[PDB]
Design a protein around this nucleic acid. Structure first.
Ligand SMILES: [Mg+2]
Ligand SMILES: [Mg+2]
Length: 758
RNA sequence: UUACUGCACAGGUGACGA
DNA sequence: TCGTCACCTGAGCAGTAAC
């Protein structure tokens, strides 16, 4: 019963002696840190400046001489550890600080992968993939009431294209439209310069420039994106260049797969544990045992949530460990009541794809047959419908048309619908060359707009998807079918819920950030999604129609109180019943907004019931990882010597980091794709400290179940649907806000029960 | 824009303080 | 205005679909 972390205990002194002085204006801190540099470690906290002597000798420092006990106030030494870790690795230059981040000294994976693939080119040496390590001192709590500091080791890869732009152009690479960044970024200076128009003298001409429209070939480099790597390498090598990428992926697997990551962390620890770490010239620390999550002793730090159940009726009796297995066997959760058993579906597609579209449609509606067990039955039989009528809407448009495609799609739709009575959904087929045009000429968003205005949800699809090989096509049709049925107001499946309290509501908010280009300030938009407890089941409620970032706290409030009102009427709560409201987002709410939300929900539900509220953040990007040494992994594909998921904790593993924080494992070996896939990073689930409901284990389990609620796919989602759906909504509504002739009027009328955002 | 995985780079940004 | 600790979202890339 044990999970291992990527962290080491740091054994610190009980206490440390310090000088303090009030400094209520923190503008002074920077100049004072400079003045006392080398003799003093300095730290501002709660309107006071704390000074720790590191070397003997001046300057002089005036203040109170107090002792800071590490058990009570671990922040002081946690902070000094940021610098001390750097000073403990003097041969490695910091590429970043706090956390100390640095590069492997010898290791360089493109050279290694080139050799491995037997590939060569004169400029390869100037494309660099270097392992990047970071050491993060973090406060954790083995047991409640006791804090410790750990040093957590993370590994990524620095991708950089050192090559001069002249050398790249002279080697035959078309730099037109590639992004370029500064070779040297001055203090607090913007890296991104813009896009390459052309090169004249010693000078790059930029468009979509961030500052000046020009820069010297020598001050600029290609940005280290995957786009610029593939663009350069395909030109210099292709289409062998894939093989270089696959060998590069093998090289990285040497650092990031479970056993290899565990080893790199061990080796890092061994190194740091070699000597004491100098906190000051008379004060030392020591890197100790690897931090573990277990229930040995007084610690209760790891549990395994039960497997999520996909449920397909109200009786609980029809359930399955996996969405598709369940859907196939049972059909959808709502088939007994599903009102519209003969849907009419508008199919909008370029006239020249007619044949390819008809085949796709036949496979969709009528299934692919018993040779493709992944999608045999087809939509009609899969969902328990009587039939699907297609209303074909060819459009006279070519893939080469970049400027009028959206006009052509929309005229065709309007013309076809005027004669064709009521359609219940649409399928819109798009050319790959049109998919990501700017929104003023983008047929996805324009047809989405027109049809949602008219109250018709759409499921769009790009031609490469339409043309997929049968083995791939079956999984596509599973997901396309699930979203389509939900777009028609269907509920494909629910997830199991153990009836605890008299009612439970979960609301989530999600963010989208929109601009036409990288030069243009991104504008924020929001979405709000609601999920209610049912009997044995979690049910999706209503979704926001306004996407307003300013005032989002009011919107969360408004949503919660409105819904609490409806739940009380529906369920007729009895005096003494308890109601639980949970909020989910990828960022924490302000204390003042938690206060306002609690205040209002409390008032709305009244004195007859008890309220419990939790405010949860879900984090994907933090310094923790969990390692399960007993997990042997699975066949990457049967029955190969190579394994995938080696050392990956099981899905639903929940580890305790601190009173407010749990780590949740989501991607088990079964869900991992490839032998080369790194050891997964778990979700960090964090409870807002003003929450009145405190069981973060239950909340972590709840977040996990809500990952299995996504009707965008058969496979589970990366974040609970409360947040995920809200993000999809935020992006769609925010984009639509700029599309002429868009009206949200039908979103709460014809589309009220449509999952139109999937 | 069937999706999942989430890499890489960029933009920066949030919360808490006083 | 600031210090401090922390990490979220968009673009484009590439491989795979929980028995
Ligand atoms: Mg979709
Ligand atoms: Mg990442």
């Amino acid at each position: 019963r044990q999970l291992v972390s990527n962290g080491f205990e740091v054994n610190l002194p009980d206490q440390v002696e310090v000088i303090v002085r009030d400094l209520p204006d923190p503008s002074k801190v920077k100049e004072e840190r400079t003045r006392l540099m080398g003799y003093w470690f300095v730290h501002w906290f709660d309107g006071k400046l704390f000074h720790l002597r590191i070397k003997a000798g001046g300057p002089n420092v005036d203040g109170e001489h107090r002792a800071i006990r590490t058990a009570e106030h671990p922040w002081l030494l946690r902070a000094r550890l940021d610098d001390a870790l750097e000073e403990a690795l003097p041969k490695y230059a910091a590429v970043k600080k706090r956390p100390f981040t640095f590069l492997a000294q010898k290791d360089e994976l493109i050279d290694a992968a080139a050799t491995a693939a037997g590939l060569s080119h004169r400029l390869l040496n100037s494309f660099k993939v270097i392992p990047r390590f970071a050491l993060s001192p973090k406060i954790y709590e083995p047991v409640d009431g006791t804090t410790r500091v750990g040093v957590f080791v993370t590994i990524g890869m620095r991708y950089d294209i050192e090559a001069s732009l002249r050398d790249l152009l002279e080697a035959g690479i078309d730099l037109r439209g590639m992004y370029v960044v500064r070779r040297k970024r001055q203090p607090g200076e913007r890296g991104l310069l813009g896009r390459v128009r052309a090169i004249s003298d010693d000078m790059v001409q930029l468009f979509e420039e961030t500052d000046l429209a020009s820069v010297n070939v020598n001050d600029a480099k290609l940005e280290g994106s995957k786009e610029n790597f593939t663009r350069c390498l395909s030109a210099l090598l292709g289409h062998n260049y894939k093989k270089l990428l696959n060998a590069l992926d093998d090289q990285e697997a040497g650092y990031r797969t479970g056993p290899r990551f565990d080893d790199a962390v061990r080796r890092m620890g061994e190194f740091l544990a070699k000597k004491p770490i100098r906190l000051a010239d008379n004060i030392n620390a020591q890197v100790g045992d690897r931090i573990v999550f277990s229930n040995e002793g007084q610690a209760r730090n790891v549990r395994l949530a039960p497997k999520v159940e996909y449920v397909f009726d109200r009786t609980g009796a029809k359930s399955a460990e996996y969405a598709w297995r369940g859907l196939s066997q049972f059909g959808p959760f709502d088939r007994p009541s599903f009102a519209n058993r003969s849907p009419r579906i508008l199919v909008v597609y370029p006239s020249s794809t007619q044949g390819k579209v008809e085949n796709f449609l036949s496979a969709f509606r009528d299934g692919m047959g018993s040779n493709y067990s992944g999608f045999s039955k087809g939509f009609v039989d899969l969902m328990g419908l009587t039939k699907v009528e297609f209303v074909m809407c060819p459009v006279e448009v070519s893939s080469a048309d970049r400027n009028g495609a959206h006009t052509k799609y929309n005229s065709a739709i309007e013309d076809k619908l005027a004669g064709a009575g009521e359609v219940h959904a649409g399928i819109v087929v798009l050319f790959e060359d049109h998919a990501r045009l700017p929104d003023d000429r983008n047929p996805y968003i324009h047809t989405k707009s027109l049809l949602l205005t008219l109250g018709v949800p759409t499921q769009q699809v790009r031609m490469p998807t339409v043309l997929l090989e049968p083995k791939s096509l079956q999984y596509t049709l599973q997901n396309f079918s699930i979203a389509t049925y939900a777009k028609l107001n269907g509920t494909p499946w629910t997830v199991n819920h153990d009836k605890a309290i008299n009612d439970e509501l979960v609301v989530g908010m999600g963010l989208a950030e929109l601009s036409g280009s990288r030069t243009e300030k991104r504008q924020r938009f929001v979405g709000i999604t609601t999920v209610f407890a049912g009997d044995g089941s979690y049910l999706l409620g209503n979704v926001s129609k306004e996407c307003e970032y300013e005032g989002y706290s009011d919107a969360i409030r408004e949503s919660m109180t409105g819904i609490l009102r409806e739940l009380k009427k529906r369920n007729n709560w009895r005096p003494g019943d308890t109601v639980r409201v949970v909020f989910h987002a990828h960022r924490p709410l302000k204390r003042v907004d938690v206060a306002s939300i609690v205040f209002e929900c409390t008032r709305e539900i009244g004195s007859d019931q008890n309220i419990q509220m939790a405010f949860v953040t879900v984090s994907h990007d933090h310094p923790f990882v969990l390692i399960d040494r007993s997990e042997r992994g699975l066949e990457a594909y049967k029955g190969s010597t190579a394994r995938k998921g080696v050392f990956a904790p099981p899905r639903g593993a929940i580890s305790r980091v601190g009173r407010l924080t749990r780590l949740l494992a989501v991607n088990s070996p079964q869900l991992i794709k490839r032998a080369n896939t790194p050891l997964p990073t778990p979700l960090l689930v964090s409870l807002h400290p003003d929450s009145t409901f405190k069981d973060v284990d239950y909340l972590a389990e709840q977040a996990l179940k809500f990952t299995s609620l996504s009707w965008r796919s058969t496979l589970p989602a990366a974040t609970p649907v409360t947040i995920f759906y809200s993000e999809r909504i935020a992006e769609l509504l925010g984009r639509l806000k700029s599309i002429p002739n868009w009206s949200s009027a039908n979103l709460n009328i014809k589309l009220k029960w449509s999952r139109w955002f999937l």
